[PDB]
Amino acid sequence: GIFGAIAGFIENGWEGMVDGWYGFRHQNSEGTGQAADLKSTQAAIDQINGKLNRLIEKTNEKFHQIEKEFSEVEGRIQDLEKYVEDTKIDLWSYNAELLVALENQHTIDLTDSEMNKLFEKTRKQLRENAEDMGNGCFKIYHKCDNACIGSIRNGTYDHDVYRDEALNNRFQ
Amino acid sequence: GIFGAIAGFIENGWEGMVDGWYGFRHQNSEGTGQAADLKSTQAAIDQINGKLNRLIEKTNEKFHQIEKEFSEVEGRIQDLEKYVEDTKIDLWSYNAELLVALENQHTIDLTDSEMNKLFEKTRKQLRENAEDMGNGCFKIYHKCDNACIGSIRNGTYDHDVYRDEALNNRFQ
Amino acid sequence: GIFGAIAGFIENGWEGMVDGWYGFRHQNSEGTGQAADLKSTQAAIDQINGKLNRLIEKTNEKFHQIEKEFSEVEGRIQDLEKYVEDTKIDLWSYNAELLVALENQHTIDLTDSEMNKLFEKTRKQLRENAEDMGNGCFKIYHKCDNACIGSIRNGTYDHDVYRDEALNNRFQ
Amino acid sequence: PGATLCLGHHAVPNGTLVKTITNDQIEVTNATELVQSSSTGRICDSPHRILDGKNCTLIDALLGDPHCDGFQNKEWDLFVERSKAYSNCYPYDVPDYASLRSLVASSGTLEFINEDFNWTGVAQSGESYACKRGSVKSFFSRLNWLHESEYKYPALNVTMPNNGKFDKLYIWGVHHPSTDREQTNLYVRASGRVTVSTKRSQQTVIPNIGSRPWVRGLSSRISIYWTIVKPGDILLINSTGNLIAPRGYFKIRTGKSSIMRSDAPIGTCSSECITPNGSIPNDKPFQNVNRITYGACPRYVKQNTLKLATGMRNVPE
Amino acid sequence: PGATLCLGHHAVPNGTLVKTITNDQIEVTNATELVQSSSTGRICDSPHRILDGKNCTLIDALLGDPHCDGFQNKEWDLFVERSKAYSNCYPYDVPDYASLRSLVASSGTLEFINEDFNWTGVAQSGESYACKRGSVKSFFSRLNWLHESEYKYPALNVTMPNNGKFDKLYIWGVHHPSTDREQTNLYVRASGRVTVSTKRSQQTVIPNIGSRPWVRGLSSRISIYWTIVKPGDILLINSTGNLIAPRGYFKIRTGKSSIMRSDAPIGTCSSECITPNGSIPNDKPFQNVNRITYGACPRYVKQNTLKLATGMRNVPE
Amino acid sequence: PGATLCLGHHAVPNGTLVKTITNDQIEVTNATELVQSSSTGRICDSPHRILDGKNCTLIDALLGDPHCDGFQNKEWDLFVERSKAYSNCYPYDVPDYASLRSLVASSGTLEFINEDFNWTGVAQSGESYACKRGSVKSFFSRLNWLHESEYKYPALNVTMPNNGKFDKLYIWGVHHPSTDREQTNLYVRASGRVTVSTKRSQQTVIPNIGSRPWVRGLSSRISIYWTIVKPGDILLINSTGNLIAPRGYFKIRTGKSSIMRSDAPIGTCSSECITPNGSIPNDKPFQNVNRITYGACPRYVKQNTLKLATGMRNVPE
Ligand SMILES: *[C@@H]1O[C@H](CO)[C@@H](O[C@@H]2O[C@H](CO)[C@@H](O[C@@H]3O[C@H](CO[C@H]4O[C@H](CO)[C@@H](O)[C@H](O)[C@@H]4O)[C@@H](O)[C@H](O[C@H]4O[C@H](CO)[C@@H](O)[C@H](O)[C@@H]4O)[C@@H]3O)[C@H](O)[C@H]2NC(C)=O)[C@H](O)[C@H]1NC(C)=O
Ligand SMILES: *[C@@H]1O[C@H](CO)[C@@H](O[C@@H]2O[C@H](CO)[C@@H](O[C@@H]3O[C@H](CO[C@H]4O[C@H](CO)[C@@H](O)[C@H](O)[C@@H]4O)[C@@H](O)[C@H](O[C@H]4O[C@H](CO)[C@@H](O)[C@H](O)[C@@H]4O)[C@@H]3O)[C@H](O)[C@H]2NC(C)=O)[C@H](O)[C@H]1NC(C)=O
Ligand SMILES: *[C@@H]1O[C@H](CO)[C@@H](O[C@@H]2O[C@H](CO)[C@@H](O[C@@H]3O[C@H](CO[C@H]4O[C@H](CO)[C@@H](O)[C@H](O)[C@@H]4O)[C@@H](O)[C@H](O[C@H]4O[C@H](CO)[C@@H](O)[C@H](O)[C@@H]4O)[C@@H]3O)[C@H](O)[C@H]2NC(C)=O)[C@H](O)[C@H]1NC(C)=O
Ligand SMILES: *[C@@H]1O[C@H](CO[C@@H]2O[C@@H](C)[C@@H](O)[C@@H](O)[C@@H]2O)[C@@H](O[C@@H]2O[C@H](CO)[C@@H](O)[C@H](O)[C@H]2NC(C)=O)[C@H](O)[C@H]1NC(C)=O
Ligand SMILES: *[C@@H]1O[C@H](CO[C@@H]2O[C@@H](C)[C@@H](O)[C@@H](O)[C@@H]2O)[C@@H](O[C@@H]2O[C@H](CO)[C@@H](O)[C@H](O)[C@H]2NC(C)=O)[C@H](O)[C@H]1NC(C)=O
Ligand SMILES: *[C@@H]1O[C@H](CO[C@@H]2O[C@@H](C)[C@@H](O)[C@@H](O)[C@@H]2O)[C@@H](O[C@@H]2O[C@H](CO)[C@@H](O)[C@H](O)[C@H]2NC(C)=O)[C@H](O)[C@H]1NC(C)=O
Ligand SMILES: *[C@@H]1O[C@H](CO)[C@@H](O[C@@H]2O[C@H](CO)[C@@H](O)[C@H](O)[C@H]2NC(C)=O)[C@H](O)[C@H]1NC(C)=O
Ligand SMILES: *[C@@H]1O[C@H](CO)[C@@H](O[C@@H]2O[C@H](CO)[C@@H](O)[C@H](O)[C@H]2NC(C)=O)[C@H](O)[C@H]1NC(C)=O
Ligand SMILES: *[C@@H]1O[C@H](CO)[C@@H](O[C@@H]2O[C@H](CO)[C@@H](O)[C@H](O)[C@H]2NC(C)=O)[C@H](O)[C@H]1NC(C)=O
Ligand SMILES: *[C@@H]1O[C@H](CO)[C@@H](O)[C@H](O)[C@H]1NC(C)=O
Ligand SMILES: *[C@@H]1O[C@H](CO)[C@@H](O)[C@H](O)[C@H]1NC(C)=O
Ligand SMILES: *[C@@H]1O[C@H](CO)[C@@H](O)[C@H](O)[C@H]1NC(C)=O
Ligand SMILES: *[C@@H]1O[C@H](CO)[C@@H](O)[C@H](O)[C@H]1NC(C)=O
Ligand SMILES: *[C@@H]1O[C@H](CO)[C@@H](O)[C@H](O)[C@H]1NC(C)=O
Ligand SMILES: *[C@@H]1O[C@H](CO)[C@@H](O)[C@H](O)[C@H]1NC(C)=O
């Protein structure tokens, strides 16, 4: 939605990722792989669980109220009782329709946010050792084995170790 | 608004663009030009048309209700009828005031989003051949004729073709 | 929140900044310092003051209404009067609960926005003379005295002056 | 040597101000109005069947006030009552007038079915000055003024079964004479009494002889009452004088009919929404024209304008 | 030589459509329903104390209709009135029936306390065909039909103080004979009169002798009335005939009790929310089952479905 | 060799928790309260004109209960009824008491204009023990107890035209004697009758002689009624005994006046919003003090606190 990652500059989702909501796919000298990112998955799921809990809070315990079905024609008083219930239902129906539109728009945008946050966290991490191809992928300009790919996913990647090799591959 | 592009790091709009909402302006060895981007224009217009349609859905067909004008002093029952209508109008008036504030805030932010998305799509595309001057413009570090500018707007720009020339102009 | 700056890629706030909401901290050949950014502080405070004013607008002047306490058992009419007031209070209570949830979510996100806008404005400004370390800090690849740090905060930094020195320090 | 490529957005010289969560006034490139605040001035006669009450209230058309005779057996989706309206028959009051007006307007029909009540012993079709039809003495067309015959008013005990598959609306009344002379001259008994009843109900009226101010020639009055008979039930009327008898029933329908007070002229056009100010389009979600509406209408709000932004923020310079 | 690292999100082949501010239909990876639209079909007898009215309305149980004798002194959180319900006693009407039904249902108890009113001069416990208890003539269990004794009905003037620390609900009535013979045979006076009163109030009923349609053997009727006596006040009854006397009081409580019209069978289960359709879970915030609810219930809305997105946008291909 | 430039935001050690769409509790740097939950305890006598009813209800001030004489011809924006209030005149009831109280409170004035009704044939200003003014027998100041003169009560037929350009509110009553002796001693007729009327309306009261409990020395009662006369209409009173006559009219106004039940002391201060708990500031949009308000008030909600974040998220460590 609003951030342009999901349904945006990322082409489509990964149906084979069944262990997380966001993750990494790589190709290197050792093969190809897929790994979920738990940080971003928990971030999105926690906020959605947060709004689920805000909605089960409801405090609508009602007992003796007004009559809402009538078998006899009575006139004024019945007109008012019917009008009151019709007025109440229309306003609550509006509240429900507005609530889902707000919540769903915000849900789509917040998941789009989490995707972009994982991207940016990864982008800044690689420093001058990689470039953004624009499709949600980085070309890594050095040999980066499974431990190296691991280091990126786990946040322990030391860009200074590979900087000279990557700079030389980048700039002719 | 929230993304800092419109009314933000972009200085102002282009009053001479009458064929699109977002677009490109260039200066090269062949002259200067202006071209609208249809992708981003349609994206913004579609979402705004979407909320227009969500608002013409209204389902307020009412027939026999309660009386709302009175020529005689009656007391309790009239007090209640007046209170009911006053209560209903205040709540719907609030719904209308809140709806426009939410919708307009979201409209401004979503157009700000589309502007930034076009920027980022263009930024990633140019790779190491251009730099962000911070005012919504890129300095392109190589000869880039009208076909070259065309290729950027149309998404077919091959940065590898110009990479050596641009890198040499960038780095002393 | 949604932008990942505050409570995100920035580790925590600066409790010693009592003259602004956003700002700069630096280390250079002359020492270390802290300076608030008035642009971004005013931007956030103005929008929050804007929503404060939108909320003090309230137009709830009511005079003769309906009775809401009863010492005698009356039945139908009293049932309706009680139901009307209970219905009204539940809907306004919902409006108040929804309003703060929307406003507070938007407040957190808009302050997160202003933080990111100051970051990006600074990032584009430095051009090829600095790099993002990912923690809200830039490594400046040249000698940058207090006047130089001043120039960045004040928007008058000329990256062309230092470009050759920074490029040479960047790239081996 | 290189090139420059700038990203930008459009702008207009005549932006429009809207409200947001944050800003009391902020200029956008375009906006549209969400509050309907104008009317054409006529009530469109389509798509709803409109019945102009003209000089007649619904109650006078129901009872049969002579200048309302053109309203016999009519149907409507919306009955339009004019402020010019006036009564020109016997002076009357209706206890719970508003409820009777509402239920007949909600039923949406003046269909009257004559039934032959068994009025042996009294003389029917009593008439009066106050209710001219042309230049002759007359009475409410749907009411039957019973008075004594050959100097007696025997204990009436009349029944009418509802064996049909719909509800019956019966309209009847009680005469209140001005003086004791009148009471005995018409009903021959010093005190009258009227008891209409069903299996559920019983409404008994005692007439109260006395003075009321001069209205259309008379100090006498009539009180109007109604009884609804359900299928399988039966109408029983027992009266020892002063009964203003029904001549039949009105059939009660359920539907979308109602009533509206308006002086707006009836025009030949089509519009789903009707207000006392006239018909209004319903293309906008809200309206500030009138709290009173009928049909598919925008919801009434107190604001006269609400601008919905339909474009980005306008940054001219 | 290098490597490629791609960032991505998950997707599912069976996404679900939801509504947003911008989109009438947009596919997300998962959603949950917020509108409850189904019921099990039974009303759970827990956690609320449910009293099945069965063949009896609340009013008939209160008065003491013989086929309602099993409802004596009962309490309830929810009284369930069945459409099968019928009266099988003396034909009656209750002016403002709805209010009496509401206040007794809100009180939530049929606790009756007998009190010894001082009825010297008249014969108590008048009975009738229309109200068989078994095969013998009987009457409303909570009402005392007073008629003349040894050919007189003396001016009754009876008092009853409320010296307790709670409110008293007194139920009484007025008999409407069919003919003048009846009136004098039972009450020995051509016109009756009943005046119950407190320090605040005075409700006087005049009986109106006349014909009403045949119901359970009789053309006679009874009108039912109530008076609430506050602590320190006193009940005074003055009647010269036609009084249907109370035998005591019902104690009025305040609480969470109510009444509901339903034909749903009573089941042994637990559910906080009750509808006429049956009990429903309250785990969702909204419901489309019935505008009538009791207990901790989802709020009724007109929509039958509202999908809340619980996952990101689904982009399969 | 280089430099480091860090971007950051402020933080405070004493953050505050607020609610969002996503979070039940989240710490922000600052917040402000939107629910008013406290009161000073006094009702400010500015800017609204406040009239402390003290020992008098509005109805007793209207009728003219002797200990309410200080309330003659007063005006108010808010009439404050105290729970100490008591009646100390003739025992009375008002059918539809609440409506009379409401319409007089909404009118906002006790302006009484004396008019010379033509009471030839009866003796005026009947008085009683139950209504001492000082130590002498007296009566309601605005009511005129008519009783027979030289042993007769002739058929009163009195009129009063409304030729002014405003509405007239007439207050009158009916006496209910305790015994038949009383009835003939005061009115000389075994049964009274009162018929006040306009061109629209007619309210006839029959007095019902009988016993009511001892209140301030008497078992007798009076029933209070009202009639509103429109310009060009006329008031006609016809009574054959038991009439409690009006001495004039109250003028009805339309405006911002009302009534409130409160024991809060009246203070000298200024506050737009009034509650029974006392005046409250209206700088916050919501309030939890009382569902009953008057003036420019925050809207009542069930929450006692709602924190609006006025700063960013607080990240101390
Ligand atoms: C209790 O007391 C009231 C009055 O206090 C009595 O009611 C009055 O009854 C008389 C009838 O005798 C009424 O008098 C009549 O008034 C008519 C209406 O006049 C108004 O309207 C016309 C225009 O329509 C104006 O010109 C006029 O100024 C008034 O505004 C008159 O039109 C009548 O006059 C005509 O007829 C008589 C013949 O009867 C002729 O003498 C006249 O010259 C003229 O041709 C007539 O005068 C009076 O209006 C009633 N008043 C009220 C308030 O109702 C009750 O009858 C009495 N009760 C008992 C039991 O006695
Ligand atoms: C004013 O006028 C009304 C009628 O216009 C009088 O009210 C009628 O009173 C008579 C009583 O004499 C009623 O007649 C009785 O009706 C009973 C009910 O019949 C209905 O229900 C049964 C099934 O329950 C059906 O079979 C039947 O078709 C009807 O649907 C009958 O059961 C009675 O008949 C039995 O008793 C009599 C002995 O009294 C025998 O002769 C019969 O053969 C049979 O054994 C009986 O016929 C009549 O229903 C009343 N009508 C109404 C509308 O109320 C008023 O009395 C009168 N007022 C005055 C003051 O006179
Ligand atoms: C129908 O029946 C009722 C009673 O069942 C009758 O109403 C009673 O009428 C008598 C009048 O004779 C009332 O008796 C009077 O009660 C007064 C009030 O007493 C209460 O309040 C005082 C304090 O104010 C307390 O001391 C007392 O305990 C009560 O709480 C007394 O003050 C009167 O006594 C004084 O006057 C008499 C002289 O009349 C002296 O004999 C006494 O010693 C003393 O000086 C008096 O006793 C009685 O309260 C009424 N009861 C009710 C329930 O209303 C009806 O009259 C009757 N109807 C008919 C038609 O007969
Ligand atoms: C699809 O619908 C709901 C929602 O999924 C939940 O919300 C996500 C944000 C994340 O928290 C998921 O792990 C959740 O499953 C699921 O139904 C709920 O499931 C939870 C846990 O399994 C359970 O405790 C609740 O009772 C369920 N709530 C409701 C209202 O049914 C459901 O399992 C999801 N299915 C899939 C395939 O994703
Ligand atoms: C300004 O007001 C409305 C809104 O503009 C529309 O919304 C934009 C997001 C985009 O979709 C534009 O192309 C639209 O014009 C315009 O009025 C509507 O115009 C449409 C199409 O021209 C027409 O079908 C509708 O009937 C109009 N709706 C209403 C409510 O009037 C209007 O033309 C705009 N004017 C300018 C100069 O932009
Ligand atoms: C914390 O609560 C309020 C809100 O702070 C204001 O909003 C910020 C966005 C920014 O505008 C701050 O400068 C504001 O202080 C403060 O109370 C308000 O203070 C203003 C100005 O000092 C005053 O005019 C108002 O009357 C106050 N409003 C209310 C409702 O009390 C308060 O001072 C803040 N305190 C701190 C320590 O930040
Ligand atoms: C509607 O009423 C008006 C006014 O009451 C009628 O116009 C009057 O008609 C009377 C008939 O007796 C004439 O004597 C007058 O000349 C008219 N006066 C005025 C002021 O108009 C009109 O005829 C009625 N129209 C319909 C259609 O019923
Ligand atoms: C509830 O009512 C039903 C129907 O009124 C009762 O069933 C009838 O009982 C009568 C008793 O006189 C029998 O004569 C009939 O055989 C039954 N008829 C029908 C159609 O059921 C039932 O007994 C009542 N049940 C309870 C628990 O009160
Ligand atoms: C308001 O009422 C109180 C209590 O009713 C009055 O105080 C009483 O005044 C009476 C007058 O007859 C005295 O006999 C008592 O001594 C007082 N008793 C109590 C308990 O206060 C007070 O005077 C009234 N005040 C006003 C302003 O009307
Ligand atoms: C009408 O009433 C008369 C008198 O009571 C009676 O003779 C007659 O049978 C009744 N029915 C009809 C149809 O005339
Ligand atoms: C509509 O008519 C009412 C009176 O019926 C008037 O107060 C209001 O101003 C009118 N509004 C418009 C928009 O004509
Ligand atoms: C009951 O009434 C009789 C007759 O009025 C009377 O004699 C008796 O004292 C009263 N009280 C009791 C307890 O019987
Ligand atoms: C519930 O019952 C009502 C009638 O009482 C019916 O109209 C409605 O369709 C039912 N709804 C469900 C969900 O069973
Ligand atoms: C008052 O009434 C008397 C008796 O009916 C009558 O003589 C007199 O004219 C009337 N009017 C006035 C002003 O006294
Ligand atoms: C206000 O008074 C009411 C009773 O009148 C009481 O229930 C409530 O707690 C009070 N609230 C405050 C804030 O004083």
Side-chain angles (χ1 to χ4, degrees), chain A residues 73-80, chain B residues 64-65 67 70 74 77 81, chain C residues 76, chain D residues 58-59 62 94-107 169 171 224-226 228 252 259 261:
Chain A
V73 153
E74 317 207 52
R76 183 153 189 209
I77 303 302
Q78 191 179 123
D79 294 331
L80 186 53
Chain B
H64 196 57
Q65 301 160 56
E67 299 295 329
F70 304 92
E74 317 207 52
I77 303 302
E81 286 158 337
Chain C
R76 183 153 189 209
Chain D
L58 178 74
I59 301 297
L62 180 85
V94 189
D96 206 11
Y97 178 103
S99 281
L100 179 58
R101 177 174 175 276
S102 168
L103 69 95
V104 177
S106 183
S107 174
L169 176 76
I171 311 295
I224 317 274
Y225 300 71
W226 72 99
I228 309 192
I252 294 187
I259 201 170
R261 297 183 184 94

Side-chain angles (χ1 to χ4, degrees), chain D residues 286-306:
Chain D
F286 306 115
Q287 58 102 0
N288 192 229
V289 178
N290 201 311
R291 73 220 304 112
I292 300 184
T293 70
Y294 179 86
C297 286
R299 295 193 155 284
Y300 184 84
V301 296
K302 290 167 157 266
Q303 303 99 319
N304 61 327
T305 173
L306 279 174

Side-chain angles (χ1 to χ4, degrees), chain A residues 88-118:
Chain A
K88 168 178 173 183
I89 298 195
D90 278 350
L91 282 146
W92 276 113
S93 302
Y94 175 85
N95 288 342
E97 191 80 43
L98 173 67
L99 181 80
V100 312
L102 286 188
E103 291 283 11
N104 292 346
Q105 188 71 58
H106 183 255
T107 290
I108 279 166
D109 285 348
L110 81 91
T111 82
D112 208 352
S113 176
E114 287 311 315
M115 186 79 264
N116 198 79
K117 300 206 242 190
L118 174 74

Side-chain angles (χ1 to χ4, degrees), chain D residues 53-56 67 71 84 86 88:
Chain D
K54 295 228 168 82
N55 283 325
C56 290
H67 77 303
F71 299 105
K84 296 283 196 295
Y86 57 83
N88 195 25

Side-chain angles (χ1 to χ4, degrees), chain A residues 69, chain E residues 37-39 276-277 288-290:
Chain A
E69 290 184 328
Chain E
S37 53
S38 63
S39 171
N277 309 65
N288 192 229
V289 178
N290 201 311

Side-chain angles (χ1 to χ4, degrees), chain D residues 75-240:
Chain D
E75 321 222 286
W76 63 91
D77 291 330
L78 183 64
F79 194 99
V80 181
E81 268 187 339
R82 312 307 200 164
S83 69
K84 296 283 196 295
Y86 57 83
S87 301
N88 195 25
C89 192
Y90 217 99
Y92 71 84
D93 72 323
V94 189
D96 206 11
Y97 178 103
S99 281
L100 179 58
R101 177 174 175 276
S102 168
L103 69 95
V104 177
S106 183
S107 174
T109 176
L110 289 171
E111 242 183 290
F112 191 82
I113 280 63
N114 282 113
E115 279 182 333
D116 219 21
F117 282 90
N118 189 2
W119 299 123
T120 62
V122 279
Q124 302 179 21
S125 321
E127 285 147 289
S128 160
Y129 168 82
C131 202
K132 289 181 179 179
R133 213 164 269 141
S135 49
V136 202
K137 74 180 174 96
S138 24
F139 196 65
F140 291 109
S141 65
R142 305 315 194 176
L143 292 162
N144 222 51
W145 196 357
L146 308 175
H147 49 217
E148 50 70 45
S149 173
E150 78 194 28
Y151 318 86
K152 209 218 202 144
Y153 196 119
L156 298 167
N157 179 48
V158 279
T159 196
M160 201 100 196
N162 190 352
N163 295 114
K165 309 264 161 322
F166 47 79
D167 297 44
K168 294 196 198 149
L169 176 76
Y170 284 101
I171 311 295
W172 49 278
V174 157
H175 180 253
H176 302 283
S178 179
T179 202
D180 290 312
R181 295 179 184 173
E182 242 175 44
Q183 168 70 33
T184 58
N185 281 0
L186 322 160
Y187 315 119
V188 126
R189 198 34 166 113
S191 181
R193 171 229 73 173
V194 187
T195 319
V196 47
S197 68
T198 87
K199 285 143 187 226
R200 291 297 305 279
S201 63
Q202 33 169 325
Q203 41 217 288
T204 324
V205 201
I206 312 96
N208 308 16
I209 326 161
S211 276
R212 340 280 180 80
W214 191 89
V215 172
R216 296 193 295 277
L218 285 157
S219 319
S220 325
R221 292 278 186 287
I222 299 206
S223 304
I224 317 274
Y225 300 71
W226 72 99
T227 303
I228 309 192
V229 173
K230 42 146 191 299
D233 207 329
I234 216 154
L235 187 78
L236 190 147
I237 300 172
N238 190 239
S239 177
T240 66

